[PDB]
Write a protein that binds this DNA or RNA. Structure first.
Lengths: 54, 188, 27, 709, 120, 240
RNA sequence: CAGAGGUGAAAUUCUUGGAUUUAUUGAAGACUAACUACUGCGAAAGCAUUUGCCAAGGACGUUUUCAUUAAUCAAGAACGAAACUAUGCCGACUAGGGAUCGGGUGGUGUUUUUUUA
């Protein structure tokens, strides 16, 4: 149990930190367009999901 | 193990950092532990397991209260003494006009502080006029007289009238032929 | 409302419990 | 209701029917005010007349406080002196009307008047068929809460003086002309003074009373009942106060210097059983102490003593029905279990004490997130466990009682369901480490929870506390409902009802379970007999093999329905009456048309008009989406749960129809055959038929002692 | 072990009420006053008077069975002053000298939320 | 005023005689706190007599005690609270008290209040699951951050109204979820303070967040069964 | 159970039908302490518990719109026991300095938090 918990937490933290940086890393499009994210968002998947919900 | 605390602002923090050795000197001559916390701004008096004076833990509470409300330290230890008490008098809820309220408490202080200083000399108290209240420290007879004078002065009686009355009463009690007469034939 | 529901229900019970003039005339 | 215009003073029931009703409503049309106002008017409809006359019989006393006076050929007047008999009096004809009614008949009429006045002033549901279309008088075990069969081998009219302890002399014949009247009034007064406050009302039925004899006979001649008199035996029926149903001592008057008249009747009424005891605070009063027993109640003991003392030395006393019922309830393997009553909760409270010690320890442990709440949610915490909790009995399926452990709010939870469950597992790991490092006497291990589908990492903490108890801590956070709603949103249109069932299982396990627990514990404290009724009903379902597919909270709801809404019956005052009321209700339930709406409250927060109609609209929407009930059968709802699916979801229609058919077969059995030991034994025999195959299995070890019985 | 009672010490500028009650606050055990211990009416508020009052109350307290005290000290409060009396300090000290175990000291004077005067 | 100089009023015209000794006729009962606390047995109480057990039961069921949570829990971090207790059931030299109210103490309130900040009060009347009616007073004092150079940290009116909305919603949800006993076991380890702080961390930083005072308003009908169940039937000695 | 209040000391008054005191309540008329200022708003007098309802107002922001619609005021209109040691050159006005109250722009990290507010 201890080994599974520790390894899963490590890989989850790595993936989460990478996705957070990828969201808040100034995603500029090819035709000069920037993208409007906010403070305290960490998932471009979740941005697409908000768009899909609306 | 009974405790008491009160809080201060930062100008008092510098002054209290200078004088805190003498505060704990007096309180450990009376067997009362005390701490000072500058990241929170708190003075605290705790009883120890060697203390034997409930009156002295109450008096230490009033000590740190006065020191937070900005009286000097010799006045503070005079409240730590035996036959002394502190009183706060509220002068806020008397008048509605702001100009009139300002004029009346400036009348209470007087020109050059003369009327306040003579009130202190006649009542043997120590009076401080802070905004909406008045802090007076001294014996119980002085505190009774000072509460009466301040309430009438925030009503419309002049402290010059009350100071003349206090002088006349002083000389009247000084001559001990009248321990029954009413003295109202003498008063103004 | 109570009047309406209770009136319709007592009408149902009375038409259920009502007897017949043939029995009345026989007895 | 069961009354009639017949004579009741012969040990019969009635005295009030058509004629008495007409004379009474005519008097109330004439007036009935305290200063001779009119209560009923000419222009009133029958609804108004009925509401008025029942309001009068509910509010006004006519036996012990006052009397009514009218003239037939000018106005009626209530006067304030009770004559210890039903007294509506006409001075134009100088008659008392209700002298056929005894005191017990008037008492039961008062209680029925109160009940129907309550059902008239009830505005929420439809009380009409509830009042007028349910003859409760069929089964005496469903009409009255304790039945008692006593046989009286009397003998002969001249053998009376030897076969009785009372005396039927000349003036006794004058006051009580028939022997049946005299003996009946003797039994009423003796049993009433013996019980005292352990009964709300009493009734004496004379079984074997033939009111018909031919022309060639002088009177009704018979030889039944061990004598030549018109009865088989005496059925003593009691409407019992459930709170004072089991008070151990029977307190009498105090002790002065002079023997008071009341203490004199006490001493001549109890004889050897009486005493003079000094209590814990220091009072000196007379009391006759009894002993409690599981199998039989103190009511049975005291009525045995009273009838064998102050009636005859030859009578036979029996209630083997309730004796066998108390036998069929399980008995925990504990000291003094036999003499322990059925309302004792000491095992449950010992469990709660151990839980509170553990609660303090885990509350004052030190964690990265401080603990916010710990809520016991177990069946033992709501007194509906089947086997009572025995220390160290670790084979009963309810050994591990569920507690919810909820931490404070924190913004740094993970947002991915598997890693979230793994973080909760991490918290439980730290808790277990701290416990095994600080309070070594406790023991602990870790198990899984597969009751929630597709959420496979739910790890629970089993803790064994050294008073012999087990708790499986499971953690509830502020993100579970959010993640389940997000998953059911992002799932596609085919798999949406599967995640509906998943989220519904989650709700019924985690969230509404706490509300359910606290509500049932409170109303169980107000209704003691709910816990033996629900234990007996769970035993019945387990022997009929329906518990594996019907959840325990639905069992508790369908058990508690008659306690919450006993209309038009009474509140149950026996394990027998409660369980049979549950069986009769579940038999008469037509769940294809009728939903179950409850308001789990103490007796007189209730579901008002808007909430009631909204729940009914939810029900009819469910029935338009499913008219036949291939997907849902029981629509049960309460204030903590207006949904109507949450507890009865995922139930096989074969199982539901089998349950209703078992209830119908049971009630038809009790209709054709009298209630007795063989009928209840046949009730508790398992079916084993209608099944296409059966598989009989045994364990290598018998588990009765380990289960704690 | 110790039997606990409260002592309400209402110490105005004119008098000194020592008033021992049991825990429930209703059954009073011993109540005396500086005004009923002193002879000179002008000295109805002296530390001497309060010391005599505390001695009488301590005698009655150890008589009936009380041994330890929660003391609650009180001023006039309301619109008048908000400072206890010389009798307050002396009565508390005299009780502790007489040998009741002083259990817990508290200051309960009625401070008005929003006082009753006319704002002229 | 014992002395001779004071005059003679109506007063001591005729006084009755000291022949009573009520402390000889009185009676020592013992009380018992609920199961929610840790130090249950708390002192004794005096009742006047027992020749009216009517009078003994009357006085005892009337009484209202109050204690400090330091003596009730062994904890000087709970020293500042005071809990009121109501005597509802009496049995055999042993009273079974019930939770009645709760106060802070006056020196604690004065100790909290400062100058260059903002004080927030918020109260709400709610109804528990036991159909008890309750009124909860909570307070919260703002704070400056670890970075602030302005000497005063004032809330605006909109921040005060928003924090009052949040505090009212939290207290309403908590009590309407709870019963009375669960509310006592929430109030003892001060959970609602941490809950309110974690909920209002987003609007404005507050520092002193307490539930200052709880008042009962209306009890339900009396239930000896439920009270005895909360706490956790006897035969005499046969004098003859 | 015999004093309480009040004063420099008194006195008037209330008190064996229990005054003062202690505890649980209930009603009434006011008032809105500490937070309370280096402040805020209103034309002035004035304005401090909560939550709504009604209408008003400033500044700010604007690549909105009208295009001289304005300023100053004698007449007229609206609003509305005290004083008692205070006293500062003014103006058609140049640079500013620390504060603070309200709005906006930018940078920047801490406190915050994450598809649900």
């Amino acid at each position: 149990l201890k080994e599974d918990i520790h390894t899963h937490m490590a890989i989850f933290e790595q993936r989460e930190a990478q996705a957070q940086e990828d969201v808040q890393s100034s995603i500029v499009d090819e035709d000069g367009f920037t993208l409007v994210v906010g403070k305290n968002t960490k998932s471009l998947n979740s941005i697409r999901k908000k768009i899909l919900n609306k | 193990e009974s405790s008491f605390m009160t809080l201060f602002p930062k100008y008092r923090e510098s002054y209290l950092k200078t004088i805190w050795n003498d505060v704990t000197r007096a309180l450990d001559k009376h067997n009362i532990a005390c701490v000072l916390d500058l990241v929170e701004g708190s003075m605290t008096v705790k009883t120890t397991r060697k203390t034997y004076d409930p009156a002295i833990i109450l008096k230490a509470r009033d000590l740190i209260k006065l020191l937070a409300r900005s009286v000097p330290f010799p006045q503070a230890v005079k409240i730590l003494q035996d036959d002394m008490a502190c009183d706060v008098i509220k002068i806020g809820n008397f008048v509605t006009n702001k100009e009139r309220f300002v004029k009346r408490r400036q009348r209470l202080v007087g020109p050059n502080g003369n009327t306040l200083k003579a009130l202190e000399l006649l009542t043997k108290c120590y009076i401080l006029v802070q905004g909406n209240t008045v802090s007076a420290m001294g014996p119980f007879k002085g505190l009774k007289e000072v509460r009466r004078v301040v309430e009438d002065c925030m009503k419309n009686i002049h402290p010059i009238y009350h100071i003349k009355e206090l002088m006349i009463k002083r000389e009247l009690a000084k001559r001990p032929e009248l321990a029954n007469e009413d003295w109202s034939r003498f008063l103004p | 409302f109570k009047s309406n529901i209770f009136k319709l229900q007592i009408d149902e019970l009375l038409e259920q419990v009502k007897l017949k003039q043939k029995h009345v005339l026989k007895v | 209701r069961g009354f009639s215009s017949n004579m009741s003073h012969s040990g019969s029931l009635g005295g009030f029917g058509t004629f008495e009703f007409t004379i009474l409503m005519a008097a109330l049309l004439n007036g009935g005010g305290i200063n001779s106002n009119k209560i009923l008017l000419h222009g009133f409809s029958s609804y108004q007349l009925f509401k008025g006359v029942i309001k009068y019989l509910a509010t006004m006393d006519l036996c012990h406080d006052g009397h009514l006076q009218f003239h037939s050929n000018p106005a009626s007047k209530y006067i304030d002196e009770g004559f210890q008999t039903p007294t509506l009096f006409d001075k134009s004809t100088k008659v008392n009307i209700l002298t056929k009614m005894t005191v017990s008949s008037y008492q039961i009429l008062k209680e029925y008047a109160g009940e129907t006045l309550r059902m008239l002033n009830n505005v929420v549901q439809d009380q009409f068929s509830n009042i007028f279309l349910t003859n409760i008088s069929r089964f005496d075990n469903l009409k009255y809460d304790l039945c008692y069969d006593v046989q009286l081998p009397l003998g002969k009219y001249n053998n009376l003086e030897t076969s009785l302890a009372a005396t039927f002399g000349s003036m006794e014949r004058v006051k009580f002309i028939t022997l049946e009247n005299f003996l009946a009034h003797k039994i009423t007064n003796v049993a009433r003074y013996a019980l005292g406050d352990r009964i709300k009302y009493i009734q004496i039925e004379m079984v074997g009373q033939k009111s018909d004899f031919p022309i060639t006979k002088r009177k009704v001649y018979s030889n039944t009942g061990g004598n030549h008199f018109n009865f088989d035996f005496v059925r003593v029926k009691l409407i019992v106060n459930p709170s004072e149903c089991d008070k151990l001592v029977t307190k009498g008057p105090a002790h002065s210097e002079t023997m008071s008249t009341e203490a004199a009747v006490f001493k001549n009424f109890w004889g050897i059983k009486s005493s003079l005891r000094r209590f814990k605070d220091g009072s000196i009063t007379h009391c006759c102490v009894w002993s409690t027993s599981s199998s039989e109640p103190i009511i049975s003991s005291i009525v045995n003593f009273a009838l064998q003392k102050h009636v005859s030395k030859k009578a036979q006393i029996s209630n083997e029905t309730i004796k066998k019922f108390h036998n069929f309830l399980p008995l925990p393997n504990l000291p003094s279990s036999a003499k322990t009553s059925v309302l004792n909760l000491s095992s449950f409270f010992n469990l709660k004490k151990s839980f509170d010690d553990l609660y303090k320890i885990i509350f004052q442990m030190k964690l990265p997130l401080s603990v916010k709440s710990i809520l016991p949610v177990g069946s033992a915490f709501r007194y509906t466990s089947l086997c009572q909790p025995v220390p160290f009995a670790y084979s009963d399926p309810d050994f591990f009682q569920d507690v919810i452990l909820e931490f404070e709010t924190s913004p740094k939870w993970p947002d991915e369901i598997t890693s979230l469950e793994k973080a909760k597992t991490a918290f439980l790991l730290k808790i277990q480490e701290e416990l095994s490092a600080n309070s070594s006497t406790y023991r602990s291990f870790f198990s899984r929870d597969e009751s929630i589908p597709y959420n496979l990492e739910i790890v629970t903490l089993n803790i064994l506390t050294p008073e012999g108890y087990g708790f499986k801590f499971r953690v509830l956070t502020e993100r579970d409902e959010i993640l389940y709603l997000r998953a059911i949103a992002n799932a596609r249109n085919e798999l949406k009802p599967e995640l509906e069932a998943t989220f519904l299982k989650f709700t019924a396990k985690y969230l509404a379970s706490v509300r359910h627990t606290r509500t049932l514990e409170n109303i169980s404290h107000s209704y003691q007999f709910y816990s033996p009724v629900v234990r007996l009903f769970k035993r019945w379902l387990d022997t009929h093999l329906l518990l594996g597919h019907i959840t325990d909270e639905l069992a508790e709801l369908i058990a508690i329905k008659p306690f919450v809404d006993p209309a038009p019956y009474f509140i149950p005052g026996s394990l027998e009456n409660g369980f049979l009321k549950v069986l009769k209700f579940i038999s008469q339930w037509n769940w294809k048309d009728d939903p179950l709406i409850l308001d789990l409250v103490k007796p007189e927060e209730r579901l008002t008009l808007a909430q009631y109609k909204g729940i009914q609209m939810n029900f009819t929407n469910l029935r338009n989406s499913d008219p036949n009930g291939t997907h849902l059968q029981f629509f049960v709802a309460s204030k903590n749960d207006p949904s109507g699916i949450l507890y009865s979801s995922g139930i096989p229609l074969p199982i539901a129809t089998r349950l209703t058919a078992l209830a119908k077969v049971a009630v038809n059995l009790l209709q054709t055959h009298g209630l007795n030991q063989q009928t209840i034994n046949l009730l508790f025999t398992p079916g084993l038929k209608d099944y296409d195959f059966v598989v009989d299995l045994r364990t290598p070890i018998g588990l009765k002692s380990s289960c704690g019985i | 072990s110790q039997v606990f009672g409260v002592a309400r010490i209402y110490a105005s500028f004119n008098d000194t009420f020592v008033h021992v009650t049991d825990l429930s606050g209703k059954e009073t055990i011993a109540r005396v006053t500086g005004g009923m211990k002193v002879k000179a009416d002008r000295d109805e508020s002296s530390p001497y008077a309060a010391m005599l009052a505390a001695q009488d109350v301590a005698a009655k307290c150890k008589e009936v069975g009380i041994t330890a005290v929660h003391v609650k000290i009180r001023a006039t409060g309301g619109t008048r002053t908000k400072t206890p009396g010389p009798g307050g300090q002396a009565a508390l000290r005299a009780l502790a000298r007489s040998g009741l175990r002083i259990g817990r000291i508290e200051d309960v004077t009625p401070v008005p939320s929003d006082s009753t005067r006319k704002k002229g | 005023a014992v002395g001779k100089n004071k005059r003679l009023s109506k007063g001591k015209k005729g006084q009755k005689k000291r022949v009573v000794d009520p402390f000889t006729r009185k009676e020592w009962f013992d009380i018992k706190a609920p199961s929610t606390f840790e130090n249950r047995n708390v002192g004794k109480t005096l009742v006047n007599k027992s020749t009216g057990l009517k009078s003994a039961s009357d006085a005892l069921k009337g009484r209202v005690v109050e204690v400090c949570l330091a003596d009730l829990q062994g904890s000087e971090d709970h020293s500042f609270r005071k809990i009121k207790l109501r005597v509802d059931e009496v049995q055999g030299k042993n009273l079974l008290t019930n939770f009645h109210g709760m106060d802070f103490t006056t020196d604690k309130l004065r100790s909290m209040v400062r100058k260059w900040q903002t004080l927030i009060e918020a109260n709400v009347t709610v109804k528990t699951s036991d159909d008890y009616v309750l009124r909860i007073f909570a307070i919260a004092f703002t704070r400056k951050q670890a970075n602030q150079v302005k000497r005063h940290s004032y809330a605006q009116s909109s921040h005060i109204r928003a924090i009052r909305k949040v505090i009212s919603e939290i207290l309403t949800k908590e009590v309407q979820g709870s019963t009375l006993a669960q509310l006592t076991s929430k109030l003892i380890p001060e959970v609602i303070n941490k809950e309110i702080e974690n909920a209002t961390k987003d609007i404005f930083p507050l520092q002193n967040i307490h539930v200052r005072k709880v008042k009962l308003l209306k009890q339900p009908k009396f239930d000896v069964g439920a009270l005895m169940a909360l706490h956790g039937e006897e035969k005499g000695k046969k004098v003859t």
